[PDB]
Design an enzyme around this catalytic site. Structure first.
Site, mmCIF file in Angstrom:
data_model
loop_
_atom_site.group_PDB
_atom_site.id
_atom_site.type_symbol
_atom_site.label_atom_id
_atom_site.label_comp_id
_atom_site.label_asym_id
_atom_site.label_seq_id
_atom_site.Cartn_x
_atom_site.Cartn_y
_atom_site.Cartn_z
ATOM 1 N N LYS B 62 0.848 -1.201 0.000
ATOM 2 C CA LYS B 62 0.000 0.000 0.000
ATOM 3 C C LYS B 62 0.871 1.233 0.000
ATOM 4 O O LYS B 62 0.746 2.125 0.840
ATOM 5 C CB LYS B 62 -0.966 -0.048 1.205
ATOM 6 C CG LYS B 62 -1.878 -1.275 1.043
ATOM 7 C CD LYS B 62 -2.817 -1.581 2.206
ATOM 8 C CE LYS B 62 -3.622 -2.844 1.823
ATOM 9 N NZ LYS B 62 -4.119 -3.540 3.047
ATOM 10 N N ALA B 64 2.609 4.627 -0.421
ATOM 11 C CA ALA B 64 1.977 5.940 -0.296
ATOM 12 C C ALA B 64 3.055 7.040 -0.201
ATOM 13 O O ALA B 64 2.967 7.943 0.636
ATOM 14 C CB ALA B 64 1.089 5.937 0.964
ATOM 15 N N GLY B 176 -15.414 -8.014 10.125
ATOM 16 C CA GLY B 176 -16.869 -8.040 10.027
ATOM 17 C C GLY B 176 -17.488 -8.317 8.660
ATOM 18 O O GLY B 176 -18.713 -8.554 8.541
ATOM 19 N N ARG B 193 -6.692 -12.994 9.534
ATOM 20 C CA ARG B 193 -6.896 -13.588 10.852
ATOM 21 C C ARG B 193 -7.904 -14.734 10.942
ATOM 22 O O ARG B 193 -7.662 -15.711 11.664
ATOM 23 C CB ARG B 193 -7.269 -12.475 11.837
ATOM 24 C CG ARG B 193 -6.039 -11.585 12.181
ATOM 25 C CD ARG B 193 -6.461 -10.280 12.853
ATOM 26 N NE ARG B 193 -7.158 -9.396 11.914
ATOM 27 C CZ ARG B 193 -7.823 -8.299 12.260
ATOM 28 N NH1 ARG B 193 -7.900 -7.926 13.543
ATOM 29 N NH2 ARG B 193 -8.399 -7.553 11.327
#
Lengths: 215, 215
Positions: B62, B64, B176, B193
């Protein structure tokens, strides 16, 4: 920071990185080490630098992941010996707080990067930078990174964080920023290519410092 | 990708990372390796995984930074054997283009991260994500990363990039997100995980695959 000058050591060869850093050591007391060198030579290069040069090391990683991952990156980085780590603010408060929690646990520091110095920073970051800086103040961040390339933005960032916060600034030299103007607002300037690509890095660093001392 | 499932291998021990990846290899054909493992065991871990498991490796860095630094990071990452690298889109178009240029030169791929999956992404990234996705289309990016945690945003991202682009999505399980719902819009889901901290990683991966096949 010695002479208010921080070297950005982005050479990707251990031999060249060691040589240049050794040549300019008498002019700085802080080295920024990022992924170009760490991914090429390994995280052990951080401890080697600290021992060899006795300089403070800021890991210029500009962490920009989720909280859980940012914690793991901070933990590995401090385990490697870094004194501080640079964190992107754009990802939000929880991502920054994860870094602050690990720094607190390990006795280290977090630098919050607000607005970046390259042209592309104008597209999305600049518009959120003031708020990112305020978020930093609300989280208790005391160390910040702002753009030498836009001193009017650096001024605005200084205004938000106050005089008590420490502000360092990249984009001097190669990207077009000026040492003296940047230092009207930042506490220290970060310089990479202008020094490490020079034919004589010590002379380049010395020249920068001479233009600084005159402030 | 095999079974539309990508393993995010964020364990920070070579022995544990190798064990879990080997236990679930029969269910995946692509492993996402990020800084937690690379900064802990070194960049050579990428080639070792590639050889050992014959899987594709996506470097979940990622990126940046500014263009020049992003180029260096991409070059070191592909030299290490990675098949693709994830790049943040918020730093702007020049930073993304620098990555695309290196990928073109080295015959590899860039995945553009638009909106992130954690709560803090709502502060600054979400508001710019649609535009970051459009920037990607304009630059010719064909691979994207979007949030499993916000399927309505994943849908909007899919709308912008079209059906021809490849979209992978993290936030499934621990954060979630749901496999089946995410797969209504993304081509593959990223799971860390829920699989690597499970008492039986192979069983966890198999259970996820079972849900997927049913779709």
């Amino acid at each position: 920071v010695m002479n208010r000058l921080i070297l950005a050591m982005d050479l990707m060869n251990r031999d060249d990185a060691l040589r240049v850093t050794g040549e300019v050591r008498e002019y700085i007391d802080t080295v920024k080490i990022g992924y170009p060198l760490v991914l090429s030579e390994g995280m052990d290069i951080i401890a080697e630098f600290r021992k060899r040069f006795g300089c403070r090391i800021i890991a210029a990683f500009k962490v920009a992941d989720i909280p859980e991952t940012n914690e793991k990156i901070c933990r590995a980085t401090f385990k490697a010996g870094a004194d501080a780590i640079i964190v992107h603010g754009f990802p939000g408060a929880d991502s920054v707080r994860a870094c602050l929690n690990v720094a607190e646990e390990m006795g280290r520091e977090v630098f919050l990067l607000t607005e970046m110095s390259h042209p592309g920073a104008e597209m999305f970051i600049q518009g959120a930078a003031d708020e990112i800086a305020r978020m930093g103040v609300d989280l208790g961040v005391k160390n910040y990174v702002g753009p030498s390339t836009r001193p009017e933005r650096l001024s605005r960032l200084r205004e938000i964080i106050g005089q008590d916060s420490f502000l360092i600034s990249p984009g001097v030299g190669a990207q077009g920023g000026d040492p003296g103007e940047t230092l009207r607002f930042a506490d220290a300037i970060i310089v990479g290519r202008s020094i490490y690509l020079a034919d004589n890095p010590a002379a380049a660093a010395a020249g920068i410092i001479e233009s600084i001392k005159d402030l």
